[model samples]
Target: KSPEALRAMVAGTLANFQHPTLKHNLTTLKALHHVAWMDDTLHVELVMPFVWHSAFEELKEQCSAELLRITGAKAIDWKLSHNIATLKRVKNQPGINGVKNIIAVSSGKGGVGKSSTAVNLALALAAEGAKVGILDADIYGPSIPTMLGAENQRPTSPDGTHMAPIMSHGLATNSIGYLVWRGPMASKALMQMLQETLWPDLDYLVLDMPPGTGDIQLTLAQNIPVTGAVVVTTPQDIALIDAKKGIVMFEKVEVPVLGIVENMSVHICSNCGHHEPIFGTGGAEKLAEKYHTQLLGQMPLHISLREDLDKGTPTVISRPESEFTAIYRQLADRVAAQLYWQGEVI
Candidate 1:
């Protein structure tokens, strides 16, 4: 085939290859950055607008086979890169310095694995080659420091004016627990930790929001420039009722609710590997259907998930090859893609 013909064939193949999470083909997403042919070897460059690690590898494999067969290329050289765009936030709310996107992980009720989901989700994003950070917005009961195993570490000031973020498990993080023991003026302190901390250039900042729709939560939601919010909930009706309220609260403030994460949707046996839906199934799907939001993912209630967090090493790091980590990575991909698809890129 001529060089132009080969390029056309390659483009056609990419157009037909759809992304599982983004639901758009590479050509539509404009992922094809460059294509060149050198000595019968085809070199292709793909630059994604979102952080996609595992899926990119899968795409390469599928595309390589098709290109080799269709274009008769001697070999394929795939170059993949990502540049996560900054999504639009609520107007008039100033964005945090050095943060491209802020994703708030919230829940209507506590003890629904909200903090864990936030931590793992941040870790998963980092694992996918994105510069990710986690902020424990749960001021009253900050759990991110402990979950990330950075509870004893405190942020240090480089110039005595702004504090530097604590690095934990390849993630830049900060929490109220690291600064004070117990306090009354929680909102003020939370704001200080948020704005005064000199966070490095980050692709995404995952805020572990405090549970409920109280005054403090409402205040933070309005003040912070969040790109989107992900409401975490269990399958139980009680939790779903609260998750619905959480979604409405975000909508009231004009902060888009990206999707819903159903945690502990099923219980997995530790020893026998038996699966059981302890908290009924399809509740999240029904909620998403009624509210017109995407069900990002469903996490199983596995023993290792709790044990790993309790040890201050999340599943994504503790058991990198485990099934739980896969679920978290998928969730991270969906969250990133959803934000890109739902919000206006700036």
Candidate 2:
């Protein structure tokens, strides 16, 4: 019963908010932001906290013994243990030399325009002269190859095992989509892509992980020297629920949550030229606050970006002059801030 879980339960059970404790919880949570309903009915929307530790403990204390036994302490322990185990594996994996950092952009589920973000984020980083590579880990839905218009493109190895990654935007890449389909075949192809991709020396290897903590994701997180993860979440509640799992997965895997990127966060009406948080305002940012990590930045639901990215031309390169590109550049700076500061020579 972490704060995040409490919020979710409240969100679903808003109709039962006549309870005084939940009311007090909502009041205290208002300090975080106003996403609650106080009348006869409740529609508790916003988050109290993203991380699960203190909130879980507090809720465990509040719930009755039997209720706590059924849904409190054990669940918290299970979650904490799972994430802790995952994180320990992250710690043991070896770090790459030239690859100063590796970040995997993932979700609890797909269709968040993550590949588009992945390619452009890497492209933007490459534009800055930070060596970058992308390993498209989507075995089931290998869209990266198509997104890059490199579908027919497949990697060949000098030795059967050491396969060279495809090159685009001055970045090396490999995708299981280049290999096979579902069943044992897809798994084999995935293994091949994972173990054999001849990634050139890289400063950052941007892994576009399959959504959720599935087998593919678990394998990659366990094997790769991933330094951190960036969870891509849309503003909707369903998406956020999945995003929360993704965050907890990273925590379990021992990879730090660099922050959340609120995709499709802003809405700008064309006729009257009005901009608002139409999709949902500050959902991810408020979550970030509760979770205590970076809110990275908001990427609005821009028509132009969607069009270009959908067409396999990343906006960073195709539409460099656009407002979205500028925003992405700002985001890249935010990501590489510490590195940029530390890279300064003595």
Candidate 3:
């Protein structure tokens, strides 16, 4: 018997007497006694009196199993009631099997090119066999699929809670719009989107979050198992101010800040050998220095990037040799450096 079991045995034996002057009971007396017997069966050798029907080992096994099952059933009852009562506490839930890692991308303000960067980055990671999946959690403007040239395909959910994702560019794409109709009716749909869907076997589930530091951000941070957040900001001062708030919100929720990315940092003349700080460069690296986080990389403001993403020709995929592609690859490598992709679930 374990030490705990022996202590319990002594306590139980003492309790049954229930009196100052206890009467000597043989059964209760024997309960506290340490007894051992070795019996050889099917080999015609016996060292102690033992039978398969009432052998000490078999008796103890039966009693322990019954006690455990009874205790386990009570625990199950309590957990079920608690889980049903607090169902909303679960969101962007970890998979039943488990996920490798979940990288979330959110900006303090919108229109900082978060979706395009997210979509392109997903492909970049997928290119390296990372088993990527993109959940365009930007419920209001789910441009991930559109930017990746995979719009209008519906995700099915015959498995109810397990929402299947839309496939695009060798990555799984599940969007708020796919599960909800597109229109003025978006907020209610977002709640439904967060609750439903099936995501399985994801090594890196990149969430292209909507632009803002609002309720949506809180909802994701509070409910999801966010491994880390990657903030996207322009090199402009105003955007950097908001990006700082984005980092704070993640920190408030205990999610690590992997890095900040400066999108549209510099613009160069296509023909005249000249470069311009279109959005006022250098804020990204400076802010990263201030925050003590790595400045992952930056992307130049080029007309071609807008064209490729809008025209379903993402530079990461179509123009893999372009300067923009190299920048994204470097950024991906930086992300890999800071965080190991999570392991698979189940």
Candidate 4:
């Protein structure tokens, strides 16, 4: 009946409303975060971390629908925003100037679709409303430039001091692939790219790491304040072994293992559209349980993913509404959620 009573009642309802993407609800974040009754309108704000765009419209609708039922307002004014969380970097190690979190997508072995996964994850975060970047850190193999559809493009340096990051598919990207080199030359080039690249303010920077626990990987892990690492692997036994090592390597360097993503765990036959575990099954889940981490999500080996990448557009963009894109979106949400809940922040 009264405005105060109505506010109290609606706040209570929102408190128990199960957010579709978050593990915690409204009250857990901060109940009554922003509420106002002005301009003859009920204006409310919902703030949460890592909520770029998974079911955002649905969440807003749920809120307005509930409040409408409670207060019977013809319409509800909802302002939605994401407070993307920052992650703790290595102690005594400095952070990248404009990047909030640096996530390393790695594997102990190559040909595991690690770069593809990294590209899609970055785009997915961008699609979800976070400022995202991708660093093609694979020096020996700089497939990121190709995958991001900027293979022929070179970065521009407005000032001799800093190299501007290449823009493609809605993400700022830098790749060692552009300068095909190995050994110390590659290492120096990567460091320069990381430091000298004029990166814009980014919420997440996905580092497409070179596959291995070798010197360059180790060096970057020690120096960069990575929020966490995601080990990519196939469902095959050998790949799982290497993926485990990748996880251990990150753990040794004090970078939290965000989770394990099983790429090509199942193969989808194009003809009948049946799913088959060509690489075997349960390896990723077993590994997650063994190392005590999350099995983020599984990607089926579809010809479309490869075709999309070949065309210089990842699945997230080429097929925005595909099931494969949905998986990437889910993975992006899970990765960001883990960083907020598990990783330390400044």
Score candidate 3 by TM-score against the native.
Answer: 0.67
What tens digits encode model 1's per-residue C-alpha lDDT throughout 189-246?
A: 8877888888898899999988998878888888888889999999999999999999
> How many clashes show up per model?
0, 8, 9, 1
Q: Once all C-alphas are superposed, what RMSD does model 4 give against the true structure?
A: 2.4
Total colliding residue pairs, candidate 1: 0
Candidate 3 residue lDDT tens string, 1-346: 3445534543453343332112332143233333222131111111111001112233334344433332222211100000000011123455323345667898866768888889877777665445677888887677877787668677777777666667777777778756553333554555445446555556667888878887656766766667668999998888999999998888888677888989888777878747798779688988898987877778888788888977875788989888788667666655643443212112
- TM-score against native, each model: 0.95, 0.68, 0.67, 0.91
* Error in Å for residue 282 of model 4: 1.5
Estimate the Cα RMSD of every predicted model relative to the unseen true structure.
1.8, 17.4, 19.6, 2.4
Write down the worst ten-residue block by lDDT for model 1: 179-188
Error of 3 at 305 (Å): 0.3
| Residue 31 C-alpha lDDT in model 2 | 21
Show where candidate 3 strays beyond 4 Å. Answer: 1-98, 180-196, 341-346
Q: Output the better candidate (3/4) by lDDT.
A: 4
Give the per-residue lDDT of model 4 (tens digit) for 1-346.
Answer: 4667866876787766664345676665553557666665677776666743675566676767667777756677877677777877668477787998888899977878998999999999888779999999887678888987799999888888888888898799888777666676667778878988878988899999889888778887877778888999999898999998888899998888989999998889999899999889998999998999888888999899889879988899989999889889988877887777675556
Higher-lDDT candidate of 1 and 3 = 1
In candidate 4, position 166 carries an lDDT of 88
Candidate 2 minimal-lDDT segment of 10 residues: 77-86
Model 3 clash tally, residue pairs: 9
Cα error, residue 156 of model 3, in Å, equals 2.0
